[PDB]
Amino acid sequence: MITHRPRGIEHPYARSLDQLYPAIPIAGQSLTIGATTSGPCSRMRCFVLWPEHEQVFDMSPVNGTDSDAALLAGGEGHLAAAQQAALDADNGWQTSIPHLPDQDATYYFEALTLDGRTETSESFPLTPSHWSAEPVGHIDIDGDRFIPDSPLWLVSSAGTHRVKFALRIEGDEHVVGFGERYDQLDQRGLRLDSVVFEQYKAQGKHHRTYLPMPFAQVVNEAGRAWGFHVETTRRTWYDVAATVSDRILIEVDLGFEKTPVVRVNTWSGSPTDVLNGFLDVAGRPAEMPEWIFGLWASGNEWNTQSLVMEQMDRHRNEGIPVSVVVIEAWSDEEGFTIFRDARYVPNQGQPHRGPDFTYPSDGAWPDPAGMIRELHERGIRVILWQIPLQKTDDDLGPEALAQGNALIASGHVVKEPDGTPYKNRGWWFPNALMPDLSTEAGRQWWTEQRRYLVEDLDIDGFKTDGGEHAWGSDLRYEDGRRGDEGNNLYPVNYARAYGDLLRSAGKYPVTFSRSGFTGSQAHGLYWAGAEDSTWEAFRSSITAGITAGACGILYWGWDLAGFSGPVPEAELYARAFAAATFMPIMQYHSEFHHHELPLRDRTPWNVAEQTGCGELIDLARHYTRVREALRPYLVAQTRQCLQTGKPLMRAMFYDHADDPEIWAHPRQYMLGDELLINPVTAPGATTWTTYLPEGQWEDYWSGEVSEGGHLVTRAVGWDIIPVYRRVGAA
Numbered sequence: 001m002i003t004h005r006p007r008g009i010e011h012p013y014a015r016s017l018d019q020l021y022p023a024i025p026i027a028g029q030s031l032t033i034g035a036t037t038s039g040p041c042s043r044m045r046c047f048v049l050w051p052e053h054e055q056v057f058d059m060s061p062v063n064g065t066d067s068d069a070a071l072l073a074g075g076e077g078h079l080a081a082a083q084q085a086a087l088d089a090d091n092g093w094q095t096s097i098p099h100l101p102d103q104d105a106t107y108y109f110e111a112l113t114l115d116g117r118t119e120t121s122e123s124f125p126l127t128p129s130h131w132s133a134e135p136v137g138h139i140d141i142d143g144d145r146f147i148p149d150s151p152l153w154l155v156s157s158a159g160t161h162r163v164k165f166a167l168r169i170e171g172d173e174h175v176v177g178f179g180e181r182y183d184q185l186d187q188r189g190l191r192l193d194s195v196v197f198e199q200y201k202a203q204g205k206h207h208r209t210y211l212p213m214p215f216a217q218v219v220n221e222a223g224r225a226w227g228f229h230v231e232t233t234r235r236t237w238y239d240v241a242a243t244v245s246d247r248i249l250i251e252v253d254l255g256f257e258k259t260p261v262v263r264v265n266t267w268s269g270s271p272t273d274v275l276n277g278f279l280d281v282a283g284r285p286a287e288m289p290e291w292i293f294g295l296w297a298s299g300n301e302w303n304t305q306s307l308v309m310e311q312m313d314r315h316r317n318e319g320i321p322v323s324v325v326v327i328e329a330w331s332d333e334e335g336f337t338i339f340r341d342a343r344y345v346p347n348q349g350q351p352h353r354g355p356d357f358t359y360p361s362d363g364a365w366p367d368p369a370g371m372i373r374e375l376h377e378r379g380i381r382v383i384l385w386q387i388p389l390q391k392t393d394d395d396l397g398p399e400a401l402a403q404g405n406a407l408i409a410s411g412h413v414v415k416e417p418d419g420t421p422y423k424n425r426g427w428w429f430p431n432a433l434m435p436d437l438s439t440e441a442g443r444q445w446w447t448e449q450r451r452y453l454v455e456d457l458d459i460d461g462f463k464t465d466g467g468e469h470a471w472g473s474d475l476r477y478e479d480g481r482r483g484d485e486g487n488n489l490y491p492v493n494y495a496r497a498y499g500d501l502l503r504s505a506g507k508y509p510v511t512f513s514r515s516g517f518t519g520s521q522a523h524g525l526y527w528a529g530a531e532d533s534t535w536e537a538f539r540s541s542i543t544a545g546i547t548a549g550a551c552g553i554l555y556w557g558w559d560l561a562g563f564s565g566p567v568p569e570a571e572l573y574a575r576a577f578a579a580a581t582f583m584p585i586m587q588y589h590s591e592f593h594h595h596e597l598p599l600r601d602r603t604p605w606n607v608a609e610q611t612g613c614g615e616l617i618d619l620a621r622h623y624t625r626v627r628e629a630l631r632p633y634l635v636a637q638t639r640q641c642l643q644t645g646k647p648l649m650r651a652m653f654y655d656h657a658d659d660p661e662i663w664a665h666p667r668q669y670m671l672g673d674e675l676l677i678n679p680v681t682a683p684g685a686t687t688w689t690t691y692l693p694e695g696q697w698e699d700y701w702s703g704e705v706s707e708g709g710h711l712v713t714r715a716v717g718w719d720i721i722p723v724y725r726r727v728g729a730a
């Protein structure tokens with residue numbers, strides 16, 4: 001059996017073994033053609049039927065190490081899985097056509113098996129595309145930066161697939177946006193794209209993101225700005241004056257129509273005007289309760305009531321208060337709906353209520369309602385982890401199988417082109433069902449299964465993890481969208497669904513997510529995702545928060561000092577904990593590690609113990625005291641942010657764009673209007689230099705006044721992070 005799928009698995013940055021590459025073939029350029037077999041073959045040929053010539057290509061076996069198998073298993077971050085996947089990718093054949101003729105054709109494959117059988121594939125269309133300057137569609141765009149004769153349309157006999165066009169950029173202009181970015185604040189000089197993807201660690205090195213947007217601000221060195229938003233949830237690409245030094249080249253997927261209309265919203269004025277313009281279209285941050293601004297405690301290996309409470313007691317006994325505990329390993333690890341070890345009756349996959357459950361005294365959670373009641377009594381809110389997938393593994397218990405069947409039977413699942421349920425193509429929870437959160441009925445069906453957690457157990461919010469799982473431009477959603485538009489939108493609908501649940505139960509919409517797109521602004525809180533415990537990851541995380549803030553993602557946090565691998569070195573923890581104190585959401589977290597030694601918790605005491613630096617507990621006391629003192633400031637500035645549209649974690653160009661020097665210090669940022677923050681991001685530093693912009697500035701720790709428009713240098717013991725306050729009028 002020969003398998004060929006023209007578009008492949010549709011991982012956004014990788015090719016499967018069985019596809020055309022490029023997936024939309026282009027006349028004049030090379031075309032690589034791949035196929036796989038279900039049993040070993042000695043030979044495969046590709047027959048390509050042009051009208052004037054039939055041609056036969058002898059294909060050659062693909063070495064899996066040279067395929068994208070490693071990337072399809074999640075990349076370098078999942079090294080063991082990636083390596084074995086490369087070895088396993090051993091049934092692929094490949095040929096390539098160096099300069100593809102501009103003529104339509106059909107093609108098929110023929111193989112000879114080792115036992116001597118000939119096998120033949122179905123026939124496939126080949127309709128090559130070319131770039132045309134004819135006005136095949138219309139770009140609808142105002143302003144004076146559009147280049148009128150730049151549009152080119154990628155057309156084939158089957159239709160129009162992509163468009164590219166250019167915008168003028170001037171010599172002094174800087175480009176900030178495209179959502180959360182991990183590499184640099186100023187995107188000028190780079191090529192990038194906007195597509196929701198899970199890059200598991202090293203997001204900066206790979207130049208990818210969980211939370212893109214097809215939007216950016218362009219700011220000159222006189223203080224003036226303009227901005228553009230491509231009004232699409234399809235993929236877009238940007239060459240931000242990398243190839244042509246005074247041109248932003250934009251490329252837009254037109255998706256799975258004859259004369260398309262591409263709308264580009266534009267704004268100009270101050271930097272704050274431009275961002276407000278975008279938020280009036282995209283959505284605005286929501287009002288949140290004050291308790292989001294205390295310390296959040298988290299750790300994946302806190303998987304019993306006793307383990308969570310032990311840590312909460314430890315926080316009290318050390319004088320390091322927490323406002324929020326995130327519990328990730330709470331459920332049966334099958335349905336993410338029921339606490340581990342809970343006993344109950346089967347009910348055909350219907351929504352449970354609290355009285356359905358009995359909790360054994362020797363089980364993982366002997367009284368989770370008592371835990372939540374008691375935590376609330378101590379001033380601590382409780383957040384439970386979630387994923388927008390339903391596992392279908394053959395080893396699942398009766399309840400998880402019933403839940404999945406009920407999901408399917410409801411209709412509220414994302415579907416393949418052929419109407420059957422989408423089976424997750426990713427490396428995380430492979431083959432799982434994916435609920436359709438694209439309509440109200442779909443969102444309610446999924447969230448109703450969880451309602452009792454809010455109404456009966458009284459939890460305060462959800463860590464709405466994942467959301468990047470939909471691959472396939474021709475998937476089907478109940479709102480009428482296909483995958484080409486729906487897949488990037490998915491994380492927005494997902495956070496929205498859980499916000500709606502919380503709100504309908506008398507709570508605030510506290511969802512905590514990693515992925516998003518245009519519209520995510522209006523749905524909860526966000527964290528920077530998964531990273532190692534390195535200095536490079538610290539610097540990249542600061543850039544993530546500032547750039548996220550520059551696209552309206554206001555309630556941003558990160559896993560301070562990294563969550564993955566060995567605990568951070570003591571100095572990184574110290575510098576990162578200090579930095580996190582001056583960011584919108586302050587949170588520590590640690591990855592699953594099979595409950596093995598050494599303990600991986602990012603608690604101040606575990607890190608102190610393993611690094612031999614007892615002083616880290618004292619430092620955490622100190623900075624958490626500072627955090628508490630900062631709470632009315634964060635509340636008041638958050639209010640002003642909702643009114644003005646300025647970020648809370650705020651790039652310097654929002655208040656001082658007329659100062660060209662700000663761009664040489666892209667990891668300094670304002671926290672609200674009054675405080676200038678400069679994290680210490682190198683090991684061994686005993687002094688640290690900060691560029692103060694125009695005005696008078698007061699040292700947060702010493703009271704020392706400094707004149708602005710200058711660099712200043714500050715001694716930086718671990719009990720100090722450079723923070724300067726504006727000196728206002730009398």
Ligand SMILES: OC[C@H]1O[C@@H]2OC[C@H]3O[C@H](O[C@@H]4[C@@H](O)[C@@H](OC[C@H]5O[C@H](O[C@H]([C@H]2O)[C@@H]1O)[C@H](O)[C@@H](O)[C@@H]5O)O[C@H](CO)[C@H]4O)[C@H](O)[C@@H](O)[C@@H]3O
Nearest residue numbers: 074198200300328329330333427428465529530590591592
């Ligand atoms: O890149 C995919 C994925 O890799 C890691 O998870 C793989 C792991 O998933 C399942 O077990 C999970 C367990 O890992 C843990 O996940 C919570 C974790 O999710 C994200 O990180 C994961 C990796 O851990 C990543 O997306 C997120 O970034 C991070 O902040 C979170 O801590 O806990 C849940 C709940 O207990 C558990 O289901 C799966 O069972 C396992 O086989 C697989 O190896």
